[PDB]
């Protein structure tokens, strides 16, 4: 079993920045990807970006290349995502989709409870 | 004769363009497959016994008779003419399975264009499972069923062995490698369009790279920790693996692949623009410099193998035990992946490897493009465009089974059955013919009157008993002991041995075919037939 | 950015009936024999869990009721033994190159 926890509820502030803590435990930390999906309340889903713990690669979708950054830390085995210029329609939840170990390329059920911002 | 200056100058003026895949790629793989150290002494003794005499004999024949690799037998033996067809078939097989290494190397060169090295990127970039990037940067011991990132790259990108479950079921065709081999064939076609190269300019610009890149790779491997374990394993006599191991077959194959004889290439390179120009010395210095470059390549491979074994805390002869041609690429990737300017050195090494393989394979087709000119000078000597294109198309259509997903399943088979018994028996037939059918004293008189200095007494005793008996013993040891091929977690079935024996027979059965075809042409009794056929016709 | 949208929009709940979901991937081709496609299941008030990966194998801790097939462009989903407890929304995700993007999603309601 691999535990995975996230931060708590936060408030949306116009033009400010927030930090979402996401620490993994019970598995190889700096060996697989760590996705960051967005789920709007009631609406569909969308992708933001991905970062490999170890400063290897840092990819993005294209709609959040500058509005969302990704930071890894192999010491405490935590992954942060510092937002920027929060808007009114950005009030949603974010997960920590741990990618598979390679060839398969899936999320092995280790989805956090999600941090809601309002 | 020691530190006089002339010798070191002659060696420095020869080390530039005296390196081929037979001594930088074929020698390390064979030496590490049969165990390092225990192969150097058999290799060098088989060389000094039967590789230099045959080389000198082929050079003398090509320099005296002034004929092609097939038309030279019209003055030697009218019956032993099928050896030319055997040489042509062997060269076709080579150019079929030898260009796949160039295809893989050029694909590596293309993939090395990215500033980020794909070798050290197995973190699900495209797809890679069960890999360990950090060797010592994580302080974690090596776990069971773990493969290096470069090994996973070579096993999943350039040679997708996961698509084919085995040799019995080969997958489709890789377009990314098909286009690579097509570009390689387009390049090789635009270089033999004329067919003359004796004082060219490209030789210098392709020879100036190795003299520096080999030295920089050697010092990089020397300044790498853990290399002391690999050097000791490379200089181990290991007398226990020499008595009754039957390893001399691989040594002889490596010798005949690196030196040149046995493929019909010395005759073509000797029957043009040369006559009585410092004989009995050029062949010796070429063999010496080839052996020196081979030893340098073996050392630069083993100094990296030592580091690879020390970083895993396991035996040196176990890291790559079920590995075929993957020994060179993985080693070079792991060696270049620890350099400051790693991408530039990698692209330079890949480009020089491509140009070296091209300059090496230019000699393979050179002995077949000129073989039909001296045999059919009335139909093929006037076109010069309808034959090279035909042989290129035939090679492309014959090198397609080695381009499937089961690449190493075919290259490994043709690496011990297409040149193992075939080249050996061809060299044996040639040697025994030149010895008994033509006459040792006759050839000695010819070389004495064309050179002005009779060869030594040691050379005369070689071609009569040394080479033929050793080659016969090697052939008997091969026939009375079928090899056992084994790739990564794979065992070849029983029909693989039959397929290899059939492959190693079609390239030799043509000689008895021509023998039976020659006697049925001339009339008369068998005695008169052999009497009139053994003696050569009027020139 | 290889976009991928599902063709259906909504279906009905019925015990023991066939219902397939297709994913439009016309601008996509199989890379190395493994179909880089995934299937998720998101219940109201629950994070989405893995349902089927690679369009051929079964997910972790998923019953044998779900099964998928297909290769290349079109992919289907066999949910023949469907009950009321499977009234969730399923998505479609492709993972070829740097193009990871989810789909629209399909719901079921009688
Ligand atoms: C890396 O790990 C994987 C699984 O985590 C290994 O895959 C399996 O290997 C065992 C034996 O080692 C086989 O019995 C299984 O059938 C394999 N799984 C599948 C799906 O085929 C793999 O061997 C390990 N080593 C590598 C990839 O080099
Ligand atoms: C790989 C090492 C090659 C070394 C080659 C040395 C050749 C020495 C030839 C000596 C021939 C002596 C003939 C004496 C005749 C009376
Ligand atoms: C994406 C650009 C690929 C360019 C490939 C160039 C290959 C040059 C090979 C030269 C061989 C001598
Ligand atoms: C992307 C992998 C390398 C692709 C190289 C294509 C080269 C095409 C050459 C066509 C010659 C006719
Ligand atoms: C001792 C093993 C003998 C194997 C013989 C295989 C068949 C050789 C002749 C093939 C003719 C095409
Ligand atoms: C650690 C021992 C290194 C020995 C290097 C020898 C190089 C010989 C070049 C001819
Ligand atoms: C089962 C197919 C074997 C093909 C061998 C080609 C050399
Ligand atoms: C044809 C020019 C070759 C220069 C060295 C390339 C590696
Ligand atoms: C000019 C076309 C030659 C085709 C040869 C096929 C063997
Ligand atoms: C698709 C055919 C590839 C070559 C098969 C040779 C037996
Ligand atoms: C044209 C070639 C004649 C000899 C064929 C031997 C197989
Ligand atoms: C090898 C030739 C066999 C037949 C000989 C007939 C004289
Ligand atoms: C037997 C081969 C002749 C040249 C094509």
Coordinates of N, CA and C in Angstrom, one line a residue, chain A residues 35 37 39 45 47 50 59-60 95 99 103-107 109 111-112, chain C residues 34 36 38 40 42 47-50 53 60 91 95 97-98 100-102:
Chain A
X35 N 1.6 13.6 -11.9 CA 0.7 14.4 -12.7 C -0.1 15.3 -11.8
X37 N -3.9 17.0 -12.3 CA -5.1 17.2 -13.1 C -6.0 18.2 -12.4
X39 N -10.2 19.3 -11.9 CA -11.6 18.9 -12.0 C -12.5 20.0 -11.6
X45 N -13.1 17.4 -17.1 CA -11.7 17.5 -16.6 C -10.8 18.1 -17.6
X47 N -6.2 18.8 -18.2 CA -4.8 18.6 -17.8 C -4.0 19.9 -17.6
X50 N 3.0 18.2 -15.7 CA 3.6 17.0 -15.1 C 5.0 17.4 -14.7
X59 N 7.0 19.2 -18.1 CA 6.1 19.4 -19.3 C 4.8 20.1 -18.8
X60 N 4.1 20.6 -19.8 CA 2.8 21.3 -19.6 C 1.9 21.1 -20.8
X95 N -5.6 17.1 -8.0 CA -5.2 15.8 -7.6 C -3.8 15.5 -7.8
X99 N 1.9 8.5 -12.0 CA 1.9 7.8 -13.2 C 2.5 6.4 -13.0
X103 N 6.1 1.5 -19.4 CA 5.4 1.0 -20.6 C 3.9 1.1 -20.5
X104 N 3.3 0.8 -19.3 CA 1.9 0.9 -19.1 C 1.3 2.3 -19.2
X105 N 1.8 3.2 -18.4 CA 1.4 4.6 -18.4 C 0.0 4.8 -17.9
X106 N -0.3 4.6 -16.7 CA -1.6 4.8 -16.1 C -1.4 5.4 -14.7
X107 N -2.5 5.6 -14.0 CA -2.5 6.1 -12.6 C -2.9 4.9 -11.7
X109 N -4.2 4.2 -9.0 CA -5.3 4.5 -8.0 C -4.9 5.4 -6.9
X111 N -4.8 8.4 -6.0 CA -5.4 9.8 -6.1 C -5.7 10.4 -4.8
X112 N -5.2 11.6 -4.5 CA -5.5 12.2 -3.3 C -7.0 12.7 -3.1
Chain C
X34 N 1.9 -1.2 -27.6 CA 1.1 -1.0 -26.4 C 0.2 0.2 -26.6
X36 N -1.4 3.2 -25.9 CA -1.3 4.3 -24.9 C -2.6 4.9 -24.6
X38 N -6.0 4.9 -21.6 CA -6.5 4.6 -20.2 C -8.0 4.8 -20.1
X40 N -10.9 5.6 -17.0 CA -11.2 6.0 -15.6 C -12.6 5.9 -15.2
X42 N -15.2 8.0 -12.4 CA -15.4 9.0 -11.4 C -16.8 9.1 -10.9
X47 N -12.7 10.7 -5.8 CA -11.6 10.9 -6.8 C -11.7 9.7 -7.8
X48 N -11.4 10.0 -9.1 CA -11.4 8.9 -10.1 C -10.3 7.9 -9.9
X49 N -10.7 6.6 -10.0 CA -9.8 5.5 -9.8 C -9.6 4.8 -11.1
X50 N -8.5 4.0 -11.2 CA -8.1 3.3 -12.4 C -9.1 2.2 -12.7
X53 N -6.3 -0.1 -18.1 CA -5.1 0.5 -18.7 C -4.7 -0.3 -19.9
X60 N -6.1 -2.4 -11.3 CA -5.8 -2.9 -10.0 C -7.1 -2.9 -9.1
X91 N -14.2 8.3 -18.5 CA -13.4 9.2 -19.4 C -12.5 8.4 -20.3
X95 N -1.9 8.8 -24.0 CA -0.6 9.1 -23.4 C 0.5 8.9 -24.5
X97 N 3.4 10.6 -26.6 CA 4.1 11.8 -26.5 C 3.7 12.7 -25.4
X98 N 4.1 14.0 -25.5 CA 3.6 15.0 -24.5 C 2.3 15.6 -25.1
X100 N -0.9 14.6 -23.1 CA -1.8 14.0 -22.1 C -3.0 15.0 -21.9
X101 N -4.2 14.6 -22.4 CA -5.4 15.3 -22.2 C -6.6 14.4 -22.1
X102 N -7.4 14.7 -21.1 CA -8.6 13.9 -20.9 C -9.7 14.1 -22.0

